[PDB]
Symmetry: D2
Subunit: 276 residues, 4 copies
């Protein structure tokens, strides 16, 4: 121990200070994902598909994930439009054995994983908990939106550690920071808050070999009660819901060398909703 400065955060960092990464002098090259492999869960859905296509535009090979809506045409669209390698995988992410099998298969098909986006999730749709007289809905949310996120993280983290590099982005939500009204959804709020702090916890644990960040989107447009959204608009400083395309910059920032000193951060993309 003598003759070394040892970290208080994680002694696996080795003698301090650690070495800064080599970076391009041109800011635009920092955002490139050329030569990197990305794996995006929930990429048959709106947000995940937008991020997957953005990563392919940035040069990444993209592993697509789906559960009930096969996304093979999406992977083949990435294939043919951007000349990257892409393939879709079927997985129920609430099953930890299935998550491990899928990620191990992706590592074999692509060689490695450089960027992972833990994005799949489901909403709570049943209103006030106090009237829901069993726990299956609570457990469904926790099992996919928290446990499933962790199954993905734990599994891909072992790949990142083997290679000494990697970027994990978790899709949280403004629901992890505030309480949505008037549609009440305590179970989802709690799971996303756990996601946001799991991000910070894993950033510390994985610092020798990877960065971990999350994005917390606000309301993103996609046959929901018009007066309820009217109240959302009224409480949103920008005055509107967001588009999936307004999220891809944040996910590319965190995935790429643009953010090599950014870890444990939560990037709010919510139209200002968390400010009032």
């Amino acid at each position: 121990s003598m003759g070394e400065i040892e970290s208080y955060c994680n002694k696996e960092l080795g003698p301090l200070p650690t070495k800064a990464p080599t970076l391009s002098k041109n800011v635009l090259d920092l955002f490139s994902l050329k030569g990197k492999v990305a794996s995006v869960t929930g990429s048959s859905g709106g947000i995940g598909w937008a991020v997957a296509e953005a990563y392919a535009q940035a040069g990444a090979d993209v592993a697509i994930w789906y559960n009930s809506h096969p996304a093979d045409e999406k992977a083949e669209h990435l294939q043919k439009t951007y000349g990257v390698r892409s393939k879709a995988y079927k997985c129920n992410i609430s099953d930890p054995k299935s998550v491990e099998e899928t990620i191990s298969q992706q590592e074999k098909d692509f060689g490695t994983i450089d960027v992972f986006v833990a994005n799949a999730g489901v909403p709570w749709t049943e209103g006030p908990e106090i009237n829901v007289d069993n726990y299956d809905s609570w457990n469904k949310i926790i099992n996919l939106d928290l446990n499933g996120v962790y199954y993905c993280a734990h599994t891909v983290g072992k790949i990142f550690k083997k290679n000494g590099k990697g970027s994990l982005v978790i899709t949280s939500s403004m629901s992890g920071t505030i309480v949505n009204v008037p549609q009440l959804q305590a179970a989802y709020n709690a799971a996303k808050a756990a996601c946001t702090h799991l991000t910070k916890s894993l950033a510390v644990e994985w610092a020798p070999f990877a960065r971990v960040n999350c994005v917390s989107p606000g309301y993103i447009a996609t046959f929901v009660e018009k007066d309820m959204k009217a109240k959302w608009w009224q409480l949103t400083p920008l005055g509107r819901e967001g588009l999936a395309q307004e999220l891809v910059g944040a996910y590319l920032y965190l995935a790429s060398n643009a953010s090599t000193y950014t870890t444990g951060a939560n990037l709010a993309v919510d139209g200002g909703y968390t400010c009032p």
Copy 2:
């Protein structure tokens, strides 16, 4: 709804504004729990027993909970010493059925429940998650420290709604706000962050009939290695661990009429640890 301002948070509040409570003119009377019934989970342990005895000193009947360390003599101690009603209940709080049965039995035994402290919990002891090859410890933490807290909350909330009054205090942790070092414990951190935000979520949902708050203790003297504790002291602005007696003021403040406009709040009692 014409002629009535109705809430954007919870229309069960009825026509706004709601009526302010009647409060004693004397500040010390606000902290009294005379004529109220308290239920404190994990009150065979250090923090929970300190809070239970404090509530008894404030005049409350106290339902004591244990799992593996029977606390009947503690109940007994409270009845004898302070003249309040008290009885100890055995319950594995990770079992939702047992939680329901125990709280219903307490309602029968004491008549009602006015104050509930969801305090039982277990730590993560196994170091960095990346070396842990199964999910049993993760699941153990989530099932008691998050799901079990929610089983307690959902069950007692129906009592609060029926009676139109109640105060729920959840024991979170500074681990819900920061990432402990050097002992890495992502699963516990995630569960406690979920607890802190479940507090806020339920505060909104239960507003017509109850208040919901949490206390986030720092390191409390309640058997670990000497160098690790030393780094805790170095990072704590007050320079020491806390005593359980330094928590009871916060729990009495939130449980009593001293805090009738306080809901959804997280009260840090951590020696300043969350500040650096």
Copy 3:
């Protein structure tokens, strides 16, 4: 240095760990202010007067502060109703020389100061900054609501350090955490956020001799546009404004031995407003 554990926060703490305070075993005695001297600025106003009277009920001598509304009858009311020593002082807290003169006079009249509440402040009333084409209103807010708070803190802190004990409570606001709507008040929001973080900063700096905490009230009732408050009520989970009497428990908690491990904390008393 050898043979001592030295703090990373503040080496003036001395060899770690520091000694825990001696505390009563009865929770209610922890809240007493008997034998202690309190100084409450802005105590001719609503919140400050409620806190002053609560501190006197708890047994404290109370120094009253006023600027444009003489409060001598208030001090004499404390005198005669509770048998404590009390006296009112005139001071424009935006004047740093006047603050130092007033606190030094109070130390002479009362012997010492044990509890200080930096509570005086003024609101921003002029709507959107972009239309206010000079800076006198901005500077008026910063000078009293931030600089004046610091003048008080810096001055009483020297007394706390001399005596080795003390508790500073700063009146912040939920405006230091969120952005009020629809009445826009950026200058006030910025000053109160600075207040909340000054609390945390001074908690670290003063840890060898004092604790520093703040209270962040929500809307407190006291001939303001009825539809504007209607929107406040709609966005407040409890559905109403608060009473000054609902704040005094928080100020007594932080002032007294009930909170001896609580420092750098922000206690939200806002009806849940910061949760949505």
Copy 4:
């Protein structure tokens, strides 16, 4: 207002919902600043010069600011190297009159301003405030690091409102979120916390015509003692200080169309320092 949903945040948004922007289908095009004019205060210094050159690489004209270190050759360097328009301006930003004159001159010289970075600032260097017998250093920090930021914001905001578009990025600091140790600097911490919340406040007020965000850097290599730096490294999860080139991605993300739904956000770029 019958027939129109109007905002609870800012009725200048007009009838809700507001219209989404037109965005490129290609993620890399979102980060371009071609055809835009940027103004970066403190761009003779380390961070500001890095951001200015990054903006020029993205295609923006860049107005450079200096105070005591003339940066005309830097402007010159940008024009020469990247073919954009650039010129350096001398201004003491603590003087509100000079700030107004400088920004009006830039509007004349460049035609408009599309992006503003309020980055100039000075540190607190004098250790614990309790030993500092006057307020000159406190006032110096507040006047530049808070008031001067606001003078810049108020002035350029009127340009943004006139043109109906703009992006303001404020350089805050992790010191607005946590308390630096062991070098104690309450005045700087308070000013930066005010900056972070001024960001959110102005995001709400300017929503009809501009976005407002801030970046909170950690320790950036930009001459201090070796033991103190060593403790910084020990408390930083990544194990090192950051480079200014590791910040430019965040500033380009916020300045460009990559972030059109991002407003009121604080982007931490601190090596994880705010996590433990």
